[PDB]
């Protein structure tokens, strides 16, 4: 039972080279470089499913900071005043109301100033 391994080696290399397509030069077309680029892309993608949740939070916080300062309040005073009250409303929909629904965000910052924090 001699078994000739050239038909499975090819499909495994096609799988790696298909995962590597779009990359520069030998990163997309030779196996020993495409393999490393695919593994590295996988590590970065694991890391960046975490940093996505880190980076969007900071953007929300920066937009809420900018929207609250137009109404005469900090970010931090706003988050404190929204817990002297009870809003349970997150950084995502507050940033969305900061850009889009500005009168509702003004109502929210006035109910935070109403709790005097």
């Amino acid at each position: 039972a001699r078994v000739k391994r050239g038909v499975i080696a090819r499909r495994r290399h096609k799988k790696i080279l298909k995962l590597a397509k779009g990359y520069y030069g030998a990163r997309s077309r030779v196996f020993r470089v495409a393999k490393q680029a695919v593994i590295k892309a996988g590590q970065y993608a694991y890391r960046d499913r975490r940093q996505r949740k880190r980076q969007f939070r900071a953007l929300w916080i920066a937009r809420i900071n900018a929207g609250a300062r137009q109404n005469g309040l900090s970010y931090s005073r706003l988050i404190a005043g929204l817990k002297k009250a009870a809003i349970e409303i997150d950084r995502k929909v507050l940033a969305d109301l900061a850009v889009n629904e500005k009168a509702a965000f003004t109502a929210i910052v006035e109910k935070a100033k109403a709790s005097l924090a």
């Binding site: 996988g42 993608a45 009870a86 809003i87 409303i89 629904e101 109502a107 929210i108 109910k111």
Partner: protein
């Protein structure tokens, strides 16, 4: 007309005709769900926000489908330590169509 509802441990800005993928809530296809966990309801210049929660407001939705979205890969690799490990994931969603805001 929009509303902020808490479905899956996270909230969604939600309007009166939208389709929305939500963490998999346990109710079969085509049935109805209510969200009595609204955080604000606004209509023009009439915006009312949650005391913690807007009392007397509910959002009605219809379950459209239970799918799984778009496999992500998990690669765990230690440099020069003979360690490599891979995993697939498809996260379940429930697509709901928002039918009423009150």
């Amino acid at each position: 007309m929009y509303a902020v509802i808490v479905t899956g441990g996270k909230q969604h800005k939600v309007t009166e005709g939208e389709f929305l993928k939500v963490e998999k809530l346990d109710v079969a296809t085509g049935e109805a769900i209510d969200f009595d966990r609204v955080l604000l309801v606004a209509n023009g210049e009439d915006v009312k926000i949650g005391l913690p929660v807007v009392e007397g407001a509910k959002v009605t939705a219809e379950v459209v489908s239970h799918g799984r979205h778009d496999k992500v890969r998990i690669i765990k690799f230690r440099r020069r330590k003979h360690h490599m490990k891979r995993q697939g994931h498809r996260q379940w969603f429930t697509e709901i169509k928002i039918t009423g805001i009150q």
